[PDB]
Amino acid sequence: AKVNIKPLEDKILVQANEAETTTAS
């Protein structure tokens, strides 16, 4: 009923990348 951070990690992994790349043009 746990260990579900793979999807959440994204929201963190996304920002990590989306942080660099130009805003969502």
CA distances (Å), origin 25, targets 7, 12, 22: 24, 20, 7
Helices (DSSP H) in 1-25: which residue ranges? 6-18
CA distance 19 to 8: 16
DSSP designation for 9: H
Tokens coding 17:
């990348």
Number of domains comprising the chain = 1
Method used to determine the 3D structure? NMR
Q: Find the domain containing 21 and state its range.
A: 1-25
Q: How many Cα atoms are found within 13 Å in the side-chain-facing hemisphere of 5?
A: 4
